């Protein structure tokens, strides 16, 4: 139709177009449709318009099938992609093409909201993990980074956060839902398929979507995928809705842009990077915001993932992104190897805003455990095996790290009542290895209901609608406190009498191995 020019030359992902005889103006940062074949049409973005009429372009599709004599067409419009409710429950090329398995166009390049369009976050976001929902809270809008070495449990925190929202969003109205997006930059297509099957199994797919830019995909497309996920998020942001967004990962986005820069012979900088990788990430993470009531009070929360090297937060990209994000969660490979999973380091982790969003019921428990762990971190290191001690600080700490040892997302009601006991000393007599079984027997099973003690009036576990009262009144309210203390005292007494006695009496090796099997099963299911 247009025939602005033709492909002069190609160097990997980057290309150069030479104009035709009747040179016609093409705007900046526009998408071009390269006529690869009779029906197939590639897609490629302009980045510089030169004096000679030559145009530098980044290719996105069919780079193996592009040649020199091929024609080039102009769209006269920005790089856009579809967006809406229909896009939910699908996995797509960042250019809108759907990836099969076994109308409204939004702009990929857009400015972030100003301070007046933004707002301080007010409501929390539950990741299903007690370490996070207790001590490192997350508001709807508070973007927070996930650090750690390779194969440490970074992607799993995001997946469990996505899976936690499914139980709630079905219950509550749709205005207060949290939809989600997961961009996978450089990850394996096998892992993306397993994630698709996981979300399909747990039915989280209806409130989620995935953007796949694998390691075999081009560098321009890996550079473009997070912008496309953010673009899908901004429609739900500006439409009042709430939505989560994930980036796995920014280090490989920076590597793809580094490829494009070095192939364009741009002047490098520290750790081979050009220098505009900070602007590159700020364009992405400033589009996350808690919008103002003047604009709908929507949201776009962002949990990016970044890989460290040998527990080194002094990396250039790591500190560039800590210089942008509203917090930090640091998983340690030392702890991941030493059994603790999730391997969060509470010293190196922090939530700069989430105190305002943390519910008071959870705020007080988080304060108590923050003080407790601040004391535990010091009393645990000062002795350095010089002399052991029997103190409630070290006791409650060892009884709490076992609760922090988790495998999947937990319900908020389940998350509190296991920690409340530790804060108030109810979990002091029980042993190290029987804490997960204690929790499973507290929450999924009910010893008072089993052993007939029904003196409690309302406080039980089978309903789970008591969450939305604990979340509004707080356990320290006068009506919930006594029934709570009675239920917990009964559960402790029945546990210590019936179960722990038999446990300490067990001496047969097959019985002890079957019991460790049970404790590992309880560690998984809890």
């Amino acid at each position: 139709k247009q025939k602005i020019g033709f492909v002069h030359g190609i160097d990997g992902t980057i290309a150069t177009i030479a104009p035709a005889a009747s040179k016609v103006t093409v705007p900046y940062n526009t998408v071009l449709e390269i006529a690869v074949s009779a029906t197939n049409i590639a897609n490629a973005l302009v980045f510089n318009l030169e004096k000679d009429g030559s145009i530098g372009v980044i290719l996105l599709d069919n780079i193996s099938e592009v040649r020199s004599g091929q024609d080039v067409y102009a769209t006269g419009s920005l790089l856009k992609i579809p967006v809406g409710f229909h896009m939910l429950g699908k996995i797509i090329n960042p250019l809108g093409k759907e990836i099969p398995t076994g109308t409204k166009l939004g702009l990929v390049e857009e400015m972030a909201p100003n301070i007046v369009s933004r707002q301080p976050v007010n409501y929390n976001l539950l990741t299903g993990y007690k370490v996070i929902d207790t001590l490192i809270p997350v508001g709807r809008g508070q973007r927070e980074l996930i650090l750690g070495d390779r194969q440490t449990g970074k992607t799993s925190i995001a997946l469990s956060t996505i899976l936690n929202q499914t139980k709630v969003n079905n219950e509550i109205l749709s205005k207060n839902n949290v939809l989600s997006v997961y961009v996978s930059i450089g990850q394996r297509c096998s892992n993306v398929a397993r994630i698709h099957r996981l979300l399909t199994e747990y039915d989280a797919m209806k409130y989620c979507t995935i953007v796949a830019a694998t390691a075999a995909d081009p560098a321009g497309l890996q550079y473009l995928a997070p912008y496309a996920g953010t673009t899908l998020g901004e429609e739900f942001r500006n439409s009042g809705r709430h939505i989560l967004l994930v980036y796995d990962d920014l280090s490989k986005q920076a590597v793809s842009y580094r490829q494009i820069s070095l192939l364009l012979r741009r002047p490098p900088g520290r750790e081979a990077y050009p220098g505009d990788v900070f602007y590159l990430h700020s364009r992405l993470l400033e589009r996350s915001a808690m919008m103002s009531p003047q604009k709908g009070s929507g949201s776009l929360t962002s949990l990016p993932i970044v890989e460290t090297l040998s527990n080194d937060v002094t990396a250039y990209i790591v500190t560039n992104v800590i210089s942008i994000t509203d917090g930090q969660i640091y998983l340690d490979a030392k702890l991941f190897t030493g059994g603790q999973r999730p391997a969060v380091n509470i010293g190196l982790s922090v939530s700069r805003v989430g105190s305002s969003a943390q519910n008071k019921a959870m705020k007080k428990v988080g304060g108590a455990l923050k003080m407790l762990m601040g004391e535990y971190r010091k009393m645990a290191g000062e002795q350095t095996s010089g002399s052991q001690n029997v103190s409630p600080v070290m006791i409650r700490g060892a009884r709490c790290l076992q609760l922090f040892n988790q495998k999947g997302p937990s319900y908020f009601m389940d998350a509190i009542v296991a920690l409340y006991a530790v804060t108030n000393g109810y979990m002091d007599d029980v042993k190290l290895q029987y804490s997960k079984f204690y929790e499973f027997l507290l929450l999924n099973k009910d010893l008072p209901v089993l052993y007939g003690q029904v003196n409690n009036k309302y406080f039980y576990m089978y309903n789970k609608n008591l969450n939305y009262f604990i979340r509004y009144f707080g356990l320290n309210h006068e009506i919930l406190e006594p029934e709570l203390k009675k239920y917990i005292e009964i559960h402790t007494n029945l546990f210590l009498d019936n179960y722990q006695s038999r446990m300490n009496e067990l001496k047969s090796d097959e019985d002890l191995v079957q019991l460790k099997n049970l404790l590992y099963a309880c560690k998984r299911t809890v």
């Binding site: 103006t25 318009l49 972030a112 301080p120 002047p267 900088g269 520290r270 220098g275 990396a315 800590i322």
Partner: protein, 487 residues
């Protein structure tokens, strides 16, 4: 008269070339294109000449939907921005346009953003201590009214929190118009600052506002990050020269000004220097710094923050920035990881007013002895990290047990970080700041344990916390006695 017109030639990033038929205007002249074509207003300053009948120029807003034959119009002047009392209690863009949606700024005159620094005859450096109430900032690196301050620190060390505490201490009780330049920092932080001030009535719109805000944040392009600092210096130099009034200038931060100029030099094609900064870094930094001086007309008390990537002081941008400032405050990461906050490194920090001619003799000798004690503690760290305190002489381990007390006492909570430490913030007066260090230095208080100094303010608060801990420990001992008797 008729306005000159030129036509675009090529575009590489935010940089653009324009062909001027008749002749080319001088450097730094602004050039405007109507928002009909690009969709938004776009002003573009000249920065260099390539040949006759050509000019290279940087854009402020984004270059999206920009074409190669667009009419550009010569304004005939540099980028002008408003000045006066109408600029008070208002938020501003790089172009000087207000963005707080309130109303039209009632300016009388507009000044350009680029300006020559004051002359040596005009400059007048009067040295006067600025009592902040922060305790490390008072002892080690006492600030100076009308001087410069540098908060050099990486990501997550507490320079933004130091800035907020200094604002809450000085600016509210300053009696002079303040300026706040946000240059490539969090829009979150700019929002929270605008709300903390509209709530503290510093930006009282129905009354008298003592503040000016200017914000080119990280979302903004490098053309803005490179030219928002100049607009803030214009706003501050107007109140320094015309009003003849003392002012404060909080800049957060100049390292992204440097990054923006580097990202621009990359598009310009200039050959880079070492680690990847712009070649004109020293010149741009001197043209920025030396504008910030205290003349006979007034005084500018600047507080510039600086970022250090990968925790590297040998980075040439900070390494050059040290020599241009009056009070350097070098923050650390290992100190923050050790629970101390503010994570100041007094051994690396330094000041200019730290002489007995300005500060009193006792405050001087005490600070000198504290720094010496900590230099000895640092030399003994190389042993303590390997063998232990048990392998040190009695003198050595006493110096260790006292330097640890000094280091824990240097930590204190701030009213801004109440969310994190869970404690109210204290305001330590200078006379009560010196006697406490003198008592901790002469061995006047050694029976007190180490932990009574952690996160407190004032020796009275120390002795209170020590009494509390003694009480709690004794109550734990009677509790364990009763639990043992019942057991």
């Amino acid at each position: 008269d008729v306005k000159q017109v030129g036509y675009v030639q090529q575009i590489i990033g935010a940089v653009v070339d324009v062909t001027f038929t008749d002749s080319v205007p001088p450097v730094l002249t602004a050039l405007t294109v109507d928002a009909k074509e690009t969709g938004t207003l776009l002003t573009m300053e000249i920065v260099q000449h390539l040949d006759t009948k050509t000019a290279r120029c940087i854009c402020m807003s984004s270059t999206d939907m920009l074409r190669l034959r667009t009419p550009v119009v010569n304004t005939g002047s540099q980028i002008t921005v408003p000045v006066g009392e109408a600029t008070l209690g208002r938020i501003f863009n790089v172009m000087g346009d207000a963005i707080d949606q309130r109303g039209p700024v009632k300016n009388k005159v507009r000044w350009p953003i680029h300006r020559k620094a004051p002359t040596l005859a005009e400059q007048s450096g009067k040295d006067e201590v600025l009592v902040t109430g922060i305790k490390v900032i008072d002892l080690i690196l006492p600030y100076c009214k009308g001087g410069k301050i540098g908060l050099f620190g990486g990501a997550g060390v507490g320079k933004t929190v130091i800035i907020m505490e200094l604002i809450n201490n000085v600016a509210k009780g300053h009696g002079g118009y303040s300026v706040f330049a946000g240059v490539g920092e969090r829009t979150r932080e700019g929002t929270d600052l605008y709300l903390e001030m509209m709530g503290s009535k510093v930006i009282d719109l129905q009354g008298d506002s003592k503040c000016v805000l200017v914000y080119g944040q990280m979302n903004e392009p490098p053309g803005a990050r490179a030219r928002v600092a100049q607009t803030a210096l214009t706003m501050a130099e107007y109140f320094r020269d015309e009003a003849g009034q003392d002012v404060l200038l909080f800049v957060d931060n100049v390292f992204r000004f440097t990054q923006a100029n580097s990202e621009v030099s990359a598009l310009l094609g200039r050959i880079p220097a070492a680690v990847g900064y712009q070649p004109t870094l020293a010149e741009d930094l001197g043209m920025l710094q030396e504008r910030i001086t205290s003349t006979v007309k007034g005084s500018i008390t600047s507080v510039q923050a600086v970022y250090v990537p990968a925790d590297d002081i040998t980075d040439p941008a900070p390494a050059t920035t040290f020599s241009h400032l009056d009070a350097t405050t070098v923050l650390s990461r290992s100190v923050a990881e050790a629970g101390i906050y503010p994570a100041v490194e007094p051994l690396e920090c330094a000041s200019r007013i730290m002489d007995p001619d300005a500060i009193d003799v006792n405050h001087y000798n005490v600070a000198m002895d504290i720094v010496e004690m900590l230099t000895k503690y640092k030399e003994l760290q190389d042993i303590i990290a390997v063998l232990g305190i048990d392998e040190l002489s009695e003198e050595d381990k006493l110096i260790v047990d006292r330097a640890r007390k000094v280091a824990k006492f240097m930590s204190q909570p701030f009213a801004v970080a109440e969310v994190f430490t869970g404690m109210k913030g204290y305001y330590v007066q200078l006379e009560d700041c010196v006697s406490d260090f003198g008592s901790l230095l002469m061995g006047q208080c050694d029976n007190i344990p180490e932990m009574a100094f952690y996160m407190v303010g004032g020796l009275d608060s120390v002795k209170e916390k020590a009494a509390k801990m003694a009480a709690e420990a004794a109550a734990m001992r009677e509790r364990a006695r009763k639990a043992a008797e019942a057991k």
